[PDB]
Write a protein that binds this ligand. Sequence first.
Ligand SMILES: *[C@@H]1O[C@H](CO)[C@@H](O[C@@H]2O[C@H](CO)[C@@H](O)[C@H](O)[C@H]2NC(C)=O)[C@H](O)[C@H]1NC(C)=O
Ligand SMILES: O=C(Nc1ccccc1)N[C@H]1C[C@H](C(=O)O)Nc2cc(Cl)cc(Cl)c21
Ligand SMILES: *[C@@H]1O[C@H](CO)[C@@H](O)[C@H](O)[C@H]1NC(C)=O
Lengths: 381, 134, 405, 49
Amino acid sequence: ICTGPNDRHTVPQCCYGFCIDLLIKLARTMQFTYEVHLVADGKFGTQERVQNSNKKEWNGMMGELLSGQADMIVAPLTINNERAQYIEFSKPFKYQGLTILVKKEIPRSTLDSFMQPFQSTLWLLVGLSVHVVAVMLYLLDRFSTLSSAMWFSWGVLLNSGIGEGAPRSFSARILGMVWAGFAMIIVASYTANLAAFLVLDRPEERITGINDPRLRNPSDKFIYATVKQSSVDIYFRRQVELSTMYRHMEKHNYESAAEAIQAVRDNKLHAFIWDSAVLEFEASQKCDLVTTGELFFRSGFGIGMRKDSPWKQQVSLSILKSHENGFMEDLDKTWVRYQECDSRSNAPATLTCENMAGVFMLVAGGIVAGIFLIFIEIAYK
Amino acid sequence: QGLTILVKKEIPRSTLDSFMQPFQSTLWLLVGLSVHVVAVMLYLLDRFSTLSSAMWFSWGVLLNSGIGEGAPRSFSARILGMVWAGFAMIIVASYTANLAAFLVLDRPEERITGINDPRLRNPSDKFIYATVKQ
Amino acid sequence: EEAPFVIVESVDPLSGTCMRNTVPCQKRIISYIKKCCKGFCIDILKKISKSVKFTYDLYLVTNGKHGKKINGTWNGMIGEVVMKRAYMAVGSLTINEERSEVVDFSVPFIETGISVMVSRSNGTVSPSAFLEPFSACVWVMMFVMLLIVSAVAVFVFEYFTIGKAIWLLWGLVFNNSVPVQNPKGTTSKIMVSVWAFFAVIFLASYTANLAAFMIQEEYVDQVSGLSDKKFQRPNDFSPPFRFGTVPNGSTERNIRNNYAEMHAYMGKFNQRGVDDALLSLKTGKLDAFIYDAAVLNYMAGRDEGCKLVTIGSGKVFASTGYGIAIQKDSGWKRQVDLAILQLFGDGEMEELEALWLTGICHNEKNEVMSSQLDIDNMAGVFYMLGAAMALSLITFISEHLFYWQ
Amino acid sequence: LLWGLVFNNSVPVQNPKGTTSKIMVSVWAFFAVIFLASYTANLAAFMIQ
Ligand SMILES: *[C@@H]1O[C@H](CO)[C@@H](O[C@@H]2O[C@H](CO)[C@@H](O)[C@H](O)[C@H]2NC(C)=O)[C@H](O)[C@H]1NC(C)=O
Ligand SMILES: O=C(Nc1ccccc1)N[C@H]1C[C@H](C(=O)O)Nc2cc(Cl)cc(Cl)c21
Ligand SMILES: *[C@@H]1O[C@H](CO)[C@@H](O)[C@H](O)[C@H]1NC(C)=O
């Protein structure tokens, strides 16, 4: 049961999940009877000056613990110095860090058309030179079989076995013997160039952690931010070497944590900063979106208690002993480990029809040219 | 001026050893057997509704030559050879690809880069280097 | 000192007892034989003393162990804090429960656990090599265009035999099996010459792309985790391979006292001393190695060449932390915590890390040339060959099938 | 004929008969197919530096 006052509507609904699982597990150890409710403010809490000179208060669930409302916190509550002066923390049960989100990069974006490795000039150049050498062979054979030689030439380039022509001269022979070499060279170089184009088409490298130099000062092709008034700025703004990124974010900020995913999937945010185990469980579910391999802020959540409850030490011992049997690992496997998708380096971009279709257009060109050319025999006869 | 490091010329030509290298002896003998295998199979399939002929045809088509004017007169032999040819093409293709791979990603060694080269963070004894004492 | 966290060093006669940036380990070990020490945790003590500001000796352990107990009597640094001969112990030390009970523990400062080390791999290539460079679509559009152009050949020579032109055409794609009856007539020859162009473009583009798949990565190559039959079944799938750990340590009880077989199986392949296993894995003497996390995540990244890499670091087993051990219920336990939780905020942690911990092979190494005797991965084409042979036998069956009628 | 064979099959001609001859020529074709292949392989390097 879960009495959520943010439906002014206090409504009883239900709630569950990884944390709830750990709680319901731990319960059997120490005979816990417990109601459960949510936070009206919907934020963790931090030390903030109030009444403009009067006091320093905690604006959230942390305060609700200190205020006397709550008695123990179970949620992804962070650990640092500032909070440690008024709470008591169990050992951490789930380490984590700071990462970035980006959509899937490119499954197939490589080739356009088949003539691409050459450029139109050399095409027409060889198309001319072939008839050139053809008629030259023709004369050299004629004056010590025209259509014959025209075939022989314009075929040998095309690897076919059409026509049974030959040279009867000596000049034509010594010429064709290297005409063949030029033929082989063209096809060779063509293959080599196409291979080059298909192997060194690196679309883009996935941006690498916070220390990626592209972020040293960002180009406007890097939209990224956090949620205004999070606990991450306590390491962004409180650090001096990030104030530039701080200004970029305060201007690029997105509305909601869910608005971040909405905007990334909307091709309007192309990178997003947050904690590891918050996005990583959405990458392996939202297969079009994955993280970066790096970790920025070393910390791990834990359970909070009012200062010096008579079992602080006890629950910490239990959460330790219950961390290595199988509980955390198995609960992750069944609760955070979809493993539905697995990305890699820039794949070798399997060929699709839509960029290999161009040659079929010349196939259709031959098809149509047939029924035209056919009656030319009937005419010439 | 500044502070730098000296190393001899790295490698002008140190890449290839032998032509059979991209394959390894097993597959060689495997195809060498299978060719005669499919040859005699074609022979029987044509014989019982020209032996040396078929032996040529087969053991030639792998070699791109134009030797011999054989053919199949059956239907079974025809439909078999039509894909025997495909296997032929595939072998040569893969061979070229593998040799290209071996010739393109043979990076012998990268020339050591300045003082901040991590190989020097603690050196392996394959890095002899010093100054003049005093 | 049992790792790149504390370093022992003898005495220097030049600059006093030894250099700066190190602190004297003055331990009258065996009988004031002075040594001096530096490293990672030494640095963190030299910053603890900047906000608790006390005085401290530095004397090592009688037994050089990590803290296993016997008969309730304790050994190791724990063994010399349980008797409170020494008010506090730091350095490389895990955090379990049987240790968490006798004394207390601070907030951890670097996370560790269990992982596995193994000689890395050869260069494997998927059995699917042949099929890769195309979508299945073109592979049927092939037959489509073949049949339609054969029909056009029908139309043309109306003005060979159509159970034969297919033979020639299909042959031409796969690089010129064997010449046959060339269809006469100028128009026909034009159409076929056109087809040859499509051929030469096709085979070329093929070889081009197939010259890509052999230039990208591979080789997960080792395991899934402690749940694999590979581990728990010693001889089922692969008989002879064998692994182990080092006894005397913490990582024992978190395997023996919870897993059954692997303990009695490793009881014959354990090595005294850490780097003995490094020597073994250098020459294939042992197959796999299990130990603490951080010592491994270091020892790999600073070898000669990264031929020895973790098995998918992103996965860990029984993730716990190091820490700082204090005598029972002293009032200090708070301050040190309040102390250390500052340094995570001040970036100094990453600083000391870069001062010691970074590894060389951080970048993705070059996907190695995969020279192949790989009958295994090229097998699929042999199996399609056999499939052709079966189609042959059944087609011959069709002969008699028509023949009886 | 021989010179033609190296450069990928210009045009068929009078095939010399006799079993031994045919053996020798079939051997030569092997050298051919290895040669052209190795060529294309290497020429697919100079365009990657
Ligand atoms: C470490 O484990 C080994 C056995 O795995 C044992 O070391 C033995 O070492 C102690 C102390 O030197 C000796 O008293 C024993 O006789 C040794 N065993 C044998 C069979 O001879 C011991 O269990 C552990 N010792 C330490 C110091 O951790
Ligand atoms: O940033 C916020 N709230 C916010 C909401 C809308 C707009 C801006 C900020 N909360 C943080 C702090 C708090 C914590 O204990 O870490 N809850 C918590 C829990 C998880 Cl799992 C991840 C984070 Cl970042 C957070
Ligand atoms: C391939 O692996 C085996 C054993 O692992 C060994 O020959 C070597 O480590 C690898 N080969 C090369 C050439 O390094």
